[PDB]
Symmetry: C2
Subunit: 48 residues, 2 copies
């Protein structure tokens, strides 16, 4: 929310909720540049 | 459940896709630092 929030918005449709060590990234493919989504999916693929 | 996908890249790195939304769960105590840093770099350039 607006007060005491662990959620940060980098851009519309791109937010991160911090939960200590764990974090949740919400990415809206209708709003976040496709290039950004692909770069992130590429990084995740490498982890595999 | 036919309206989404769930995938695990490594322990502590899983994603849920539903509609236009991509929800990535990252456990930084289990996912390599390099990986987390490259993702953060991408988000910041977006800012």
């Amino acid at each position: 929310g607006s007060h005491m929030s662990s959620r940060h918005q980098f851009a519309p449709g791109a937010t991160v909720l911090y939960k200590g060590d764990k974090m949740v990234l919400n990415l809206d493919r209708s709003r976040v540049p496709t290039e950004c989504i692909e770069k992130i999916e590429a990084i995740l693929k490498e982890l595999e």
